[PDB]
Structures are given as structure tokens and as C-alpha cells.
């Protein structure tokens, strides 16, 4: 047949995991993930749910078993820092996503293991190719994108990206389109500021380094007061 049935079901697994978006800019990258329907008693700043920081200059927006993803996230940190210790210089986003996407095929190569049920939208910056946005899935393939989604309702999200995305837009324009996308692909009756996570990458404070903030729930309110509803 030329198919793998566990791997088609691992792709069906990430299709249960809630919707996640990532959009590039002409100078930066954005990430925007939905937390699905959740109990009132869950904590809201201690819960490491969808987004993470893999070195000074790379993030991830994950959909899957978070438990699987944690090990890959940790190995990306270890590899990135060991690269930075090897070359005294930053790890490119593509080398990092290659290394993690190998592992996710290396288990898929095999009968002694299940493959990891995790998709990974990566944002990062380097002095190879500037800002890079990557996407990677349970079989271990990877692809670069300008604007992409993973997890549940991936297709409905890419139908909202397809016609609206204009190639030149800035970071703070993409912060609109992430919420236009997520709210149209919402898995809940409506959004609230605690139900989503965001992280961004920008060219330093101004020149030199890179700026790499995670939005805390008030900063998430601050981007919702804008591009919101009436």
C-alpha cells in the first residue's frame, strides 16, 4: 500500500489536540495557540501548555501529548546549548528542526516504539537566513512556511490564512491575523484572555541582539482589547 497505519493514526492523534497558528512578518515572527475547554480550578501562569523557549532566539507552538513534547523540547535545549558551546555562535532554526524531526522519523522507522504524537510550529532567528518559520509532524518530515497551523482544525485555519495573508506585513499586523484566524477556528463558544498563549521574536531592543518575550495573561489582554469584538 505504501502506508503506515500507526503513523496515520498518530496524524489523527495530533488532529484531536486543539488548534495552533504561527505567522511570520517582514521583521519578526508570532505564535498563537488555543487551550481547549478547561476547568475553573486550573492554574493560568504556572501551566506550561502550548508555547516554550528553546534557546535565546527560538520558540515552539506545540500540539500533541505535552508529555511527549517535553522530551523533544528538552533535547532541543540540550542540542542548541551544546551547539552554542561547540561553535560559540547561535544554532540556526533549520538545523534544530532537522535534529528534532530526525528523532520523530527514527521512532517511526521502528516496531519497538510508538512514534511521538507531537506536531511543532517553530519560530526563530539566525544569521544564516534571518527569521525562519518551520513546521514538523509525527512521521518526522519538516517544511518551512510564511503562515501555518497545526493540531485540530488545521485545514479550517489554513483556509483563513490563504487569502488574507499579504507577504510584507509587520509583527504587530500578524498579532491581528492570528486572532482573526483562531476566533474563526475557535474550539470554544468564545475566547477569553486566559484561554490562549503567545510568544514573539524581534530585532533586539534596536539592532545588535534579539528580543524574545512571552506574553503574560495581562499582555494577552493587551493584544485582545485590540482586534477584539463589540
Amino acid at each position: 500500500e505504501g502506508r503506515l497505519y500507526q503513523v496515520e493514526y498518530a496524524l489523527e492523534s495530533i488532529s484531536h489536540a486543539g488548534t495552533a497558528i504561527g505567522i511570520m512578518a517582514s521583521d519578526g515572527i508570532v505564535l498563537a495557540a488555543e487551550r481547549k475547554v478547561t476547568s475553573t480550578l486550573l492554574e493560568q501562569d504556572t501551566s506550561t501548555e502550548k508555547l516554550y523557549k528553546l534557546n535565546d532566539k527560538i520558540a515552539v507552538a506545540v500540539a500533541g501529548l505535552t508529555a511527549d513534547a517535553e522530551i523533544l523540547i528538552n533535547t532541543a535545549r540540550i542540542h542548541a546549548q551544546n551547539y552554542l558551546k561547540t561553535y560559540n555562535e547561535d544554532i540556526p532554526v533549520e538545523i534544530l528542526v532537522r535534529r528534532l524531526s530526525d528523532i520523530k522519523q527514527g521512532y517511526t522507522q521502528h516496531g519497538g516504539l510508538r512514534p511521538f504524537g507531537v506536531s511543532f510550529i517553530y519560530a526563530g532567528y539566525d544569521d544564516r537566513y534571518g527569521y525562519q518559520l518551520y513546521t514538523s509532524n509525527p512521521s518526522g518530515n519538516y517544511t518551512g512556511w510564511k503562515a501555518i497551523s497545526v493540531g485540530a482544525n488545521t485545514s479550517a485555519a489554513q483556509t483563513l490564512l490563504q487569502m488574507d495573508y499579504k507577504d510584507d506585513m509587520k509583527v504587530d499586523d500578524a498579532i491581528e491575523l492570528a486572532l482573526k484566524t483562531l476566533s474563526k477556528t475557535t474550539d470554544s463558544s468564545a475566547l477569553t484572555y486566559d484561554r490562549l498563549e503567545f510568544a514573539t521574536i524581534r530585532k533586539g531592543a534596536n539592532d545588535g541582539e534579539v528580543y524574545q518575550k512571552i506574553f503574560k495573561p495581562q499582555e494577552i489582554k493587551d493584544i485582545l482589547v485590540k482586534t477584539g469584538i463589540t
Partner: protein
């Protein structure tokens, strides 16, 4: 240049650390600081190793490292080389970012916490500067007077060739670096 001097001194909400001419041997980690007298190989190997460990810690624990925790990290990590100990005298410094306490500590090559809180001296030289430093110091200075006496301590530690120094002033919520 074949063996550095690092000097360290304490005051009210402030600390100073001083260092050689060239490759300053004061490394820094956001809000902890590490002077290292030693072989340049081990000095940069410790920066490589502590960049790795301190970035892993900074990423994992969702806070940067504090001076007391860095003290124990360099102690246990030098003890990880107990049979082949790096040729170093680290002199950690900082203000603890929760309490505002000054902290300084020295170590031997196998990671003893040499907790000498009055002032700390480290090199292959040492003997003359320990005698000067205890004589020129007075307790509980403010940052500028703390700077004036540590800069006098280095300017007297200067063997008569002249060549300058770098002086960090490390303070509650501020840091400055003076090419003396």
C-alpha cells in the same frame, strides 16, 4: 600576562570586583558575576560550561541564577573534576535579587566555598594585595567610596612595570564597568 588578579569588596547594597588588562576575566550572567583567575583555557572552558549550565538553569527554573546558588553550582562542578581540577580561583559576586544582600565568595580548584565576606583576593600574586586590602578597607561604604578604595587597592597592587584594570561596581538594581 600569565596569571590574573581578581579583588572583591563589600558595601551597603553594593560590591566591587576588579580584573586584569587583556579578554576581561570578569564574566557575567545577567545578575550574577564571576571573576576567574586561572589559565585562559580553563577560564574560557568555565565560561563555555557555565554559559551552558546557566542558560539551562535560566530556561528550566523560569528565573536566572542567584549568587548563593551559583556559589554551590561552581563548587559541585569543580568537584565533578576532583581528580583533574581546573586551574582556577573563581570569585563569584552579586547582589541576591530577592533580599538585596551583597554576596562575594572565593574557591580553591576543587570547589571549597571560601566564604571570606570582608574582602576576597585571588591570584598567583595575592600576598601584597591582601596586606594592602585589609589596610585600605573600611566597612559599610556606599558605591562611590567602595569604588575609591578598591581602585586604590588595584592601583597599589600594580607592580611598577604602567598598566590599568577593569572595575565592576555591582549594585542592587545597577551595574557599571570602568576601564581604570
Amino acid at each position: 600576562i600569565n596569571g590574573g588578579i581578581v579583588v572583591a569588596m563589600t558595601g551597603k547594597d553594593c560590591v566591587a570586583i576588579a580584573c586584569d588588562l587583556r579578554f576581561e576575566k570578569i564574566f557575567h550572567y545577567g545578575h550574577v558575576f564571576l571573576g576567574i583567575t586561572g589559565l585562559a583555557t580553563d577560564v574560557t572552558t568555565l565560561n563555555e560550561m557555565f554559559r551552558y549550565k546557566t542558560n539551562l538553569y535560566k530556561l528550566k527554573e523560569e528565573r536566572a541564577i542567584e549568587p548563593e546558588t551559583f556559589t554551590q553550582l561552581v563548587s559541585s562542578s569543580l568537584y565533578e573534576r576532583r581528580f583533574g581540577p581546573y586551574f582556577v580561583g573563581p570569585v563569584v559576586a552579586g547582589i541576591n535579587s530577592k533580599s538585596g544582600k551583597p554576596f562575594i565568595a572565593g574557591f580553591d580548584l576543587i570547589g571549597c566555598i571560601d566564604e571570606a565576606k570582608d574582602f576576597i583576593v585571588s591570584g598567583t600574586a595575592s600576598d601584597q594585595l591582601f596586606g594592602m586590602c585589609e589596610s585600605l578597607y573600611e566597612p559599610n561604604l556606599e558605591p562611590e567610596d567602595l569604588f575609591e578604595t578598591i581602585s586604590q587597592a588595584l592601583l597599589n597592587a600594580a607592580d611598577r612595570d604602567g598598566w590599568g584594570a577593569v572595575v565592576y561596581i555591582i549594585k542592587k538594581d545597577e551595574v557599571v564597568k570602568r576601564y581604570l
